[PDB]
Amino acid sequence: ILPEVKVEGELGGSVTIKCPLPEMHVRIYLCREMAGSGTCGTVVSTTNFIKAEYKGRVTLKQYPRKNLFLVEVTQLTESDSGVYACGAGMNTDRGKTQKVTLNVHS
Amino acid sequence: ERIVLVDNKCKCARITSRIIRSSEDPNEDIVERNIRIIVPLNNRENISDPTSPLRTRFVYHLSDLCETCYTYDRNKCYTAVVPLVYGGETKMVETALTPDACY
Amino acid sequence: RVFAIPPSFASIFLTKSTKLTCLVTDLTTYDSVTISWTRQNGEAVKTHTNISESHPNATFSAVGEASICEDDWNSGERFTCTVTHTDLPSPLKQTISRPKGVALHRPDVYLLPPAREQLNLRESATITCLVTGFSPADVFVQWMQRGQPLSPEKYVTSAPMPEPQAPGRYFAHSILTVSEEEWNTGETYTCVVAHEALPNRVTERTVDKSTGKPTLYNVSLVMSDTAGTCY
Amino acid sequence: REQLNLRESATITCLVTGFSPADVFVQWMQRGQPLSPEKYVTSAPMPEPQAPGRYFAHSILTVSEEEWNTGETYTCVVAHEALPNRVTERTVDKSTGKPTLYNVSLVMSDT
Amino acid sequence: REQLNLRESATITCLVTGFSPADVFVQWMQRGQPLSPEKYVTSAPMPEPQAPGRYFAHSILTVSEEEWNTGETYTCVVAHEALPNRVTERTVDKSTGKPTLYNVSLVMS
Amino acid sequence: LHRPDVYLLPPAREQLNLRESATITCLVTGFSPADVFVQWMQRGQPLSPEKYVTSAPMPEPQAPGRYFAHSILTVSEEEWNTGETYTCVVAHEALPNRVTERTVDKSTGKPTLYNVSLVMSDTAGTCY
Ligand SMILES: *[C@@H]1O[C@H](CO)[C@@H](O[C@@H]2O[C@H](CO)[C@@H](O)[C@H](O)[C@H]2NC(C)=O)[C@H](O)[C@H]1NC(C)=O
Ligand SMILES: *[C@@H]1O[C@H](CO)[C@@H](O)[C@H](O)[C@H]1NC(C)=O
Ligand SMILES: *[C@@H]1O[C@H](CO)[C@@H](O)[C@H](O)[C@H]1NC(C)=O
Ligand SMILES: *[C@@H]1O[C@H](CO)[C@@H](O)[C@H](O)[C@H]1NC(C)=O
Ligand SMILES: *[C@@H]1O[C@H](CO)[C@@H](O)[C@H](O)[C@H]1NC(C)=O
């Protein structure tokens, strides 16, 4: 198992998410896994991709020096809530490395 | 809580164990043992040669786990050699059977 | 018409005898023609002998080759190819510059089996190989059957084309056709590809009758000594 | 199937083969409603090696993986000057290459 | 099912519903070859009872059970005057909706 | 001259029904010539010599040149809720590493609830 870091928002406007950056892997995603089936749907990932809904409010900045990657999301709405994950490899499910939760008190 | 007895990656067997407390007494503390194998289904017989027939039989001698192999590992590269006739020049070249894991 | 073909990475990486070719066609036959090569700074390089014979339909067909360092090509130095003919006193100058390399990316290789409906006809089966999302272009693809390479004339390869969903990305196709009996004899076919991004420069995928969307999952799960001695 | 593990996109390919002469026309639609023409690409008629003068073509379409999983069907239509109705359609969905049957056989023993 | 336990013939029906106006055209072709109009019949546009200002038709095709157990996609083309390009077709075969079947054979010991 | 084979056994099931104590037995066999002694350490700390009682080397029922010995130790019943594993050890000259630490714990032993959960997929080609 791997950590279950949790973050909150304290009313909308901005939010910041951090996950560990593995080595020797080129793909990095933050799929939301908020589906009844459970199959995680990649939201924002490298190798060129993005979410039909999440556009212009999502960006990724990988930092090998700190062994971390940073994703910045502007504003906030009702849809982009729940939980989120992080990982690598070429299999969104079975390749996760964290389970973060997103909530807003607004 | 659960300790790990086997973490084989070639056979994906994760043998573990745990003892559950009884109903507020030190007696009949039944022990447990969890086994979880994940069959590949789409892998070949000779995992490093993409010509052998498909893998039908799966034999698991649990004693050995706690050499023919079944699955690949997320931390290794598999390679082979193939003939290329570019310009009528048969030539052997190393081919990354499992790419993205040879970087 | 003066045609120039730059060397391909599939030729460089496989022969290490790289050269660049300028050829002339659709031109009245006239001996005593000079082929030269010019860089951006005016230096001349050696042009090779053994010029190609003229085409039977009374037109030119010539070969001119020279060797330039691969590091020089990677430096992005503009080069010019010139040919001289008395018909056109002004020599024709054409550029064979190599534009270094744009962001490199690996080509995903998906190989698909023939359609079920096609096999219903029991005539012939077609196997495809969809390379996808490689930048830049010039991927090289080949097919072999059970460890034996096939003729280049038994399959057709497309050319890199833009990708609407991904800016600055390219994709290509390739199809092989064989009889139904061959597909139904467990014969195995593979689609090797070659690209600069590839870590080993070569990768391959393979399918057969049993692996291409099978109708049966025959399994023989067998375990023993489950108790055993585990520590 | 591998393309699906990335949970990003999906590529359905429509393959037209054997026609003669050239100038075929391919369009994509679902549930009878035509699809936007900026989401698919079609190749020009290309000669067939063995065939004396027959040609072939191929078109691909990219959709979201979710959409594929949702269960939506996507039909492909071709219009050539030789078909008796001059129009033909085909259809594929999640239920196309499902394994028809399983034949598992567990033989658990302690010896 | 009970029709097939006779080994003489089977009938395939092509229900068409909810169109307007009348004069729909239905014909049956096998693997791209249209079949003779004598091998099948066709109903006439008759009103839809619960749905007002509507019509529906029918068509059946007789076929030997010997060849139905071998393939023969047997598509049913319809030509109305309100379709996106005026023509549509569907097909069904012996394995149109066969489901998955499990054969577990535990040798528990 | 053969490797001295060694074994260890846990307390009896019916022994854990009076709530007084428990015994753990470390059996040492072989070691020809007979040169062994056992020291019962727990967590790397040797126990008092008054607890474990080694007796003597004894020839095996059929003894060409082989021998054997038995050594037990007494613990408290209420301490087995945590185990502590009560390690045993042997020493002999006919051993490449001259130590064969042997230890068992409540967890080690016979299982009473097997829970096999095998799964079948087509994306298990690589073990993540
Ligand atoms: C499985 O495939 C491997 C690779 O082809 C076989 O081992 C190779 O054997 C060739 C000669 O036949 C050697 O040139 C290679 O060096 C071998 N590979 C390695 C990694 O040493 C292997 O024998 C095959 N197994 C079976 C059962 O056929
Ligand atoms: C299915 O497995 C059995 C053994 O369990 C074997 O006899 C048979 O040949 C297999 N089927 C095929 C098509 O190989
Ligand atoms: C199905 O499984 C049985 C039992 O292993 C076997 O005898 C039979 O051959 C299998 N059938 C096929 C087609 O593999
Ligand atoms: C179904 O299982 C039985 C019993 O093992 C076997 O005899 C039969 O061949 C199996 N059928 C198939 C299609 O595998
Ligand atoms: C048996 O294994 C399954 C799968 O891991 C688990 O959900 C279940 O809780 C286990 N039962 C016990 C008693 O541990």
Numbering used by the authors:
A (entry chain I): 19 to 124
B (entry chain J): 3 to 68, 98 to 134
C (entry chain A): 346 to 576
D (entry chain B): 461 to 571
E (entry chain C): 461 to 569
F (entry chain L): 449 to 576
From the study:
Two binding sites (position 1f and 3f) which have highest occupancies of FcμR, reached high-resolution (3.5 Å and 3.1 Å) in the cryo-EM maps, thus allowing the atomic model interpretation of the FcμR Ig-like domain and the IgM binding interface. Due to the quasi six-fold symmetry within the Cμ4 domains in IgM pentamer, the FcμR molecules at position 1f and 3f share almost identical interactions with the two Cμ4 domains (Cμ4-A and Cμ4-B) in subunits Fcμ1 and Fcμ3 respectively. The Cμ4-B chain of the IgM subunit (grey in Fig. 4b) contains a central hub of residues (Asn465-Glu468) for FcμR binding, which interacts with all three CDR loops on FcμR including CDR1 (Arg45), CDR2 (Thr60/Ser63/Thr65) and CDR3 (Thr110/Asp111). In addition to the common features, different interactions between FcμR and binding sites at subunits Fcμ1 and Fcμ3 result from the asymmetrical structure of IgM pentamer. Met108 in FcμR also forms hydrogen bonds with Tyr576 at the end of the same tailpiece. The interactions with the tailpiece residues may provide extra stabilisation for FcμR, directly reflected in the high occupancy at position 1f.
A key common feature of the FcμR binding sites is that only the Cμ4 domains are involved in the interactions.
